[PDB]
Amino acid sequence: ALGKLQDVVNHNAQALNTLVKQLSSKFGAISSVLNDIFSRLDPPEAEVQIDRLITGRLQSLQTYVTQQLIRAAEIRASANLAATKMSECVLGQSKRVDFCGKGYHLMSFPQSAPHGVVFLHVTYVPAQEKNFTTAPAICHDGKAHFPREGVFVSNGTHWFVTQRNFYEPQIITTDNTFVSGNCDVVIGIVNNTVYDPLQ
Amino acid sequence: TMSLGAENSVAYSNNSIAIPTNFTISVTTEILPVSMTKTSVDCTMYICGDSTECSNLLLQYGSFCTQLKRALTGIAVEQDKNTQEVFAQVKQIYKTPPIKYFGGFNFSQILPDPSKPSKRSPIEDLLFNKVTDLICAQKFKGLTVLPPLLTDEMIAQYTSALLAGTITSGWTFGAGPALQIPFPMQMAYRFNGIGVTQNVLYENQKLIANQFNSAIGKIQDSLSSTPSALGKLQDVVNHNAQALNTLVKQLSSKFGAISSVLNDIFSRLDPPEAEVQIDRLITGRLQSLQTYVTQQLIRAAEIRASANLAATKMSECVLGQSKRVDFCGKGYHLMSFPQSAPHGVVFLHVTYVPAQEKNFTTAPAICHDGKAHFPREGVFVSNGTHWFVTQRNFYEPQIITTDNTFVSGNCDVVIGIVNNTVYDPLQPELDS
Amino acid sequence: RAGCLIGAEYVNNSYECDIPIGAGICASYQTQSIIAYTMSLGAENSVAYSNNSIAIPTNFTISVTTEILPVSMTKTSVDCTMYICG
Ligand SMILES: *[C@@H]1O[C@H](CO)[C@@H](O[C@@H]2O[C@H](CO)[C@@H](O)[C@H](O)[C@H]2NC(C)=O)[C@H](O)[C@H]1NC(C)=O
Ligand SMILES: *[C@@H]1O[C@H](CO)[C@@H](O[C@@H]2O[C@H](CO)[C@@H](O)[C@H](O)[C@H]2NC(C)=O)[C@H](O)[C@H]1NC(C)=O
Ligand SMILES: *[C@@H]1O[C@H](CO)[C@@H](O[C@@H]2O[C@H](CO)[C@@H](O)[C@H](O)[C@H]2NC(C)=O)[C@H](O)[C@H]1NC(C)=O
Ligand SMILES: *[C@@H]1O[C@H](CO)[C@@H](O[C@@H]2O[C@H](CO)[C@@H](O)[C@H](O)[C@H]2NC(C)=O)[C@H](O)[C@H]1NC(C)=O
Ligand SMILES: *[C@@H]1O[C@H](CO)[C@@H](O[C@@H]2O[C@H](CO)[C@@H](O)[C@H](O)[C@H]2NC(C)=O)[C@H](O)[C@H]1NC(C)=O
Ligand SMILES: *[C@@H]1O[C@H](CO)[C@@H](O[C@@H]2O[C@H](CO)[C@@H](O)[C@H](O)[C@H]2NC(C)=O)[C@H](O)[C@H]1NC(C)=O
Ligand SMILES: *[C@@H]1O[C@H](CO)[C@@H](O[C@@H]2O[C@H](CO)[C@@H](O)[C@H](O)[C@H]2NC(C)=O)[C@H](O)[C@H]1NC(C)=O
Ligand SMILES: *[C@@H]1O[C@H](CO)[C@@H](O[C@@H]2O[C@H](CO)[C@@H](O)[C@H](O)[C@H]2NC(C)=O)[C@H](O)[C@H]1NC(C)=O
Ligand SMILES: *[C@@H]1O[C@H](CO)[C@@H](O[C@@H]2O[C@H](CO)[C@@H](O)[C@H](O)[C@H]2NC(C)=O)[C@H](O)[C@H]1NC(C)=O
Ligand SMILES: *[C@@H]1O[C@H](CO)[C@@H](O[C@@H]2O[C@H](CO)[C@@H](O)[C@H](O)[C@H]2NC(C)=O)[C@H](O)[C@H]1NC(C)=O
Ligand SMILES: *[C@@H]1O[C@H](CO)[C@@H](O)[C@H](O)[C@H]1NC(C)=O
Secondary structure, eight states: OOHHHHHHHHHHHHHHHHHHHGGGOOTTSSOSOHHHHHHHSOHHHHHHHHHHHHHHHHHHHHHHHHHHHHHHHHHHHHHHHHHHHIIIIISSOOOSTTTSSSSEEEEEEEEEETTEEEEEEEEEEEEEEEEEEEESOEEETTEEEEESSSEEEESSSOEEEEOTTSOOOBOOBSSSEEEOSOTTSSTTOEEOOOBOSOO | OOOOOOOOOOOOOTTEEEEEEEEEEEEEEEEEEOOOOEEEEOHHHHHTTTOHHHHHHGGGGOSSHHHHHHHHHHHHHHHHHHHHHHHOOOSEEOOOOSOOOBTTBOOTTTSOOSSSTTOOOHHHHHHHHHOOOHHHHHHTTTEEEEOOSSOHHHHHHHHHHHHHHHHHHTTGGGSSSOOOOOHHHHHHHHHHHHTOOHHHHHTSHHHHHHHHHHHHHHHHHHHHHOSGGGHHHHHHHHHHHHHHHHHHHTTSOOTTSSOSOHHHHHHHSOHHHHHHHHHHHHHHHHHHHHHHHHHHHHHHHHHHHHHHHHHHHIIIIISSOOOSTTTTSSSEEEEEEEEEETTEEEEEEEEEEEEEEEEEEEESOEEETTEEEEESSSEEEESSSOEEEEOTTSOOOBOOBTTSEEEOSOTTSSTTOEEOOOBOSHHHHHHO | OOOOOOSOEEOSOOOOOSEEEETTEEEEEEOOEEEEEEOOOOEEOOOOOOSSEEEEEEEEEEEEEEEEEEOOOOOOOOOHHHHHTO
16 A cells, blocks of 8 residues: 555665676776776876766766756655645645545545655535436426526425435425516426425 | 736725626636656667667666656656546536426536537537657657557546536535535525525626536637637647657767768778767767656656646646635636646636626724624615615615614714614504 | 467456556456456446436535645755776
């Protein structure tokens, strides 16, 4: 499960190893040891071997530094993402889809890991669905009624209004609907009774 | 001297407001690169070619080629990772019903075409024609191209499943199991999402469907006509070609030696200096390979950033409705549709744009019976002689009653409060 | 399309990818032998769309998932004189 973090560690180790292994290359010189070159050659002709060795080792170290800079940029991007997630999923509730887990985000908990962070996301998943017949508006007394905050459903014989994410049927009244226009504009309107709680 | 734009002055005052009276459905496009080419390099064939006597001297330079192979293999696997994390955002391969009636909305230009063997949409076919021997010549020098893991048909299948899910279920399939809903009711939910009431959609359904169909047709025509709309993808191709060409051009540079061909170097002069010139050529070619790998790494990092942005947009504009400004187009975001393009993705964003604004007088509160009244959900407007209350993004005046206002305090604190009547619906019923 | 594959039996079923060969071809160790197949994108599903039908959930589930992000890496220091000249 913790591969990503391990990958980071492994990468660094590899780099160091490679650098050490570059100390056994002679880069076209007669030997890989400076002491041998200086003790076997006279200085006017011993400069070319030392030049070759120095240039090769400088090139290796420069390559190491460049690879490190690129990796540091990537790690910085990851840490910026982690900081944004700490702000928006642990210190609040997020409406962005799939940002703080799969489902409707409820909350998050942070944990520390070697060189990293772990987020536990708690979300809400709907389940156990049923089929219903639905209409856009209800016709009553020549007027068109729309649900204030729900949706009209039918179980086969009678019409109710429910909230959209959890099934909870209720009687259609003038307190959970509003009127706009008449019954000859909306496509698919159905006839039913709207209950007045006052008369 | 370049001009920055056209000057405009807004008619600000203490009690003037502008309310839109119409709207427009807009569809716009966004192009994002996702992946780049996967290349492999053969050290021995590039540096020394066919001369095996050259291949012997390479062993005295350490592990310089294993490192380059490692870097290129990392880039290669990262490309497939990018594509997978952009396009494989669903678990079920959803299908669209055989009947293609969705309340008047057409959708035919973005749905797959069964006649063609590729099963691509009409718009997707046009994209794959705009974005487009040397390959064998480069192959004969140690430079090869690896095929991507997902084919074009599989990516088309992924986009088709995303489209079917979003057309039949709304945003429910991105948070769990897919729940079916009629399309006009979906778009009424989205109108609620942007702050407009449902009746506005249900009373203008034909006009909105016609506007959407016209916008999609215009997108098709504009893509067919303008050739420079896909330059974001083309650059990704071009930057590859140059990178290879330069590499080839480094195989004819002397690097200070007598000539570029090493066989003539071996056949002309004595080994004591042949070693020197061979070493010069080897160092030059190794340096060129290292440079190529370095800019390849930097380009891969940039492409990874672009692909992360594309995956976020797939999550937030296609699988949901976004309140972030300008993230899913210009306007108030309604929905989005994905299309696959060579090495990239195209998003068609459908947004709502207000139109035909009108001037009105306005007040913060209404004074009645020594009490201050504030609107519950809208704003108070005056057409000159009468006062109404309306919703903020669409002109629809209504009488001021106690059902669409609320009371707080008296008329001695609010600056700019006006006098009017608040109608009580209980008294007419009581007296009748 | 990636080349010539030797030592694997091609089967006509589809599974989730194990070892990517390329061009939609993956390989796995099953049965026991090594097989090559075309990867499956997912399970088939169809949604019952109609003029006036809606689906509404009656229950829910509380789900907890994990996300792992790297934050920092190792801090290294190099001495030129000892690495190059010893
Ligand atoms: C739809 O729901 C209504 C709920 O009111 C059901 O009507 C009730 O059914 C019960 C049977 O368990 C009766 O005891 C009640 O008297 C009924 N109410 C009324 C007002 O008559 C109705 O049966 C349901 N329809 C279906 C097909 O399940
Ligand atoms: C809902 O009720 C209205 C009237 O209450 C129905 O309208 C009638 O439709 C018939 C057609 O069969 C006409 O002959 C009548 O003149 C109409 N009446 C009025 C007052 O306009 C309407 O048909 C009903 N809805 C449905 C779906 O049947
Ligand atoms: C309404 O706007 C006008 C300007 O269009 C304001 O007029 C002057 O505003 C300054 C700012 O403090 C005052 O010192 C002046 O006394 C105002 N002029 C007059 C004739 O009153 C005006 O103040 C604004 N309304 C309110 C209530 O401040
Ligand atoms: C709102 O705008 C739409 C178009 O954007 C208007 O519908 C057009 O009306 C004119 C009449 O002047 C017709 O010629 C066009 O054919 C209509 N367009 C379409 C697409 O049908 C509509 O009238 C505007 N609303 C108001 C109240 O003016
Ligand atoms: C309601 O149900 C379906 C889904 O759109 C439609 O049924 C098909 O509609 C097309 C378009 O008119 C016809 O060509 C087909 O013959 C219909 N097939 C069947 C099996 O009904 C139906 O038309 C929709 N309602 C409306 C008003 O279009
Ligand atoms: C949906 O859009 C397609 C394409 O815009 C329409 O097909 C066109 O229909 C007209 C009239 O029949 C023809 O002149 C065009 O040649 C057709 N174009 C293509 C590409 O086939 C189609 O009529 C629209 N409506 C429906 C219900 O499919
Ligand atoms: C709302 O009222 C303002 C104020 O008069 C109008 O702005 C003026 O528009 C005319 C255009 O004929 C310009 O000549 C003036 O310079 C504008 N005045 C200012 C202060 O900018 C505005 O056009 C009106 N809007 C509507 C829809 O009627
Ligand atoms: C502002 O709106 C009010 C209410 O809509 C207008 O009053 C109506 O005007 C029409 C046309 O002049 C008459 O047919 C109605 O009888 C009026 N109703 C009432 C209750 O007076 C008013 O005319 C509009 N005023 C302006 C300046 O546009
Ligand atoms: C709204 O009505 C109240 C009461 O009718 C007004 O308050 C009066 O203001 C005049 C100023 O000309 C005073 O002479 C009266 O003594 C006030 N009466 C009371 C009971 O306070 C108020 O001015 C009106 N609103 C506006 C904007 O004029
Ligand atoms: C909603 O789902 C929960 C489980 O997530 C149901 O509770 C379980 O019901 C089964 C069957 O009766 C029992 O064996 C379990 O002990 C219950 N609890 C758990 C934690 O599983 C619950 O009954 C469902 N609600 C409805 C209305 O069916
Ligand atoms: C709704 O009915 C269809 C048949 O038209 C069925 O396939 C589907 O499973 C039903 N949905 C639910 C949630 O039972």
